[PDB]
Amino acid sequence: FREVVEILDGKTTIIEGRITETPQESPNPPNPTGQCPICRWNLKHKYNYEDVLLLSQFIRPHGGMLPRRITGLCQEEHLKIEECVKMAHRAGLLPNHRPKLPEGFVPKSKPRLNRYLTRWSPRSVKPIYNKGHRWNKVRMPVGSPLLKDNVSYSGRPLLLYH
């Protein structure tokens, strides 16, 4: 990992990059012939928004997500990982991956409302004033359709719209 240091020393600005030692991949994966990292460790269709230990390796220190080129994930899995990270942040997990702003933490606001499996964003959904009868019912989405391929031990399909 490389970091940029900018120093001001008497009307002289010096900018230099320093290399920090980076943790490497574990030595023995169960499926050495895999292509993308997710299916190389037999993690295909076996992770969810709860798996913080997996989603904390494809995100930036300030909550952003690394590009697909660097990680090497396939497009199908990259979107699923992207969806899970968005759901993880809204669920309240990953508390150390928020940016630091000393001026803004002091003015507290209304207490946070606990939530999980939020498909959309809190500021972009409008109340369902006219719900409707059973033959034309506006169903509140829960979870994402990208995670409907996960393994179901119970065997019943996941109820995405309820």
């Binding site: 895999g34 292509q35 993308c36 299916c39 295909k44 396939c74 199908e76």
Partner: protein, 154 residues
Amino acid sequence: PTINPRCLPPPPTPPQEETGLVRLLRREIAAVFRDNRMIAVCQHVALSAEDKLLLRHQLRKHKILMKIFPNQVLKPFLEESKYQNLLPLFVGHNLLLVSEEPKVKEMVRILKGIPFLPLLGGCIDDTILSRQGFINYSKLPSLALVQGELVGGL
């Protein structure tokens, strides 16, 4: 399918066929590296069209020509050739100077007339030089003068 084909190892690599245009550049690079004694590399810089044409005319006065080759057909060629040590100079944008009966006294003067046209290096008579080596080679006398002074020292 039981396993998605994306996760499976890739199929055998199809053999790409080199077309006529690629093969045309291969022999031109071979030709320009064979019959020419001086090969000077340079960092190509986006200049004015009038100024770029003016540079061509000025280099024409001393029989010096310049050509541009893409790295797609030049880096693989130089890697297999005896000039593999010029590869670090052919990573980014580049410009190639070609001359017969090498003489860099009139070439460096043009280069120093424009302060933003770097002279990276090059190979002169199968000998790789840096910019300082080019400068020392420029101040060096000709074959007749040096050999004429050789008998004086012996």
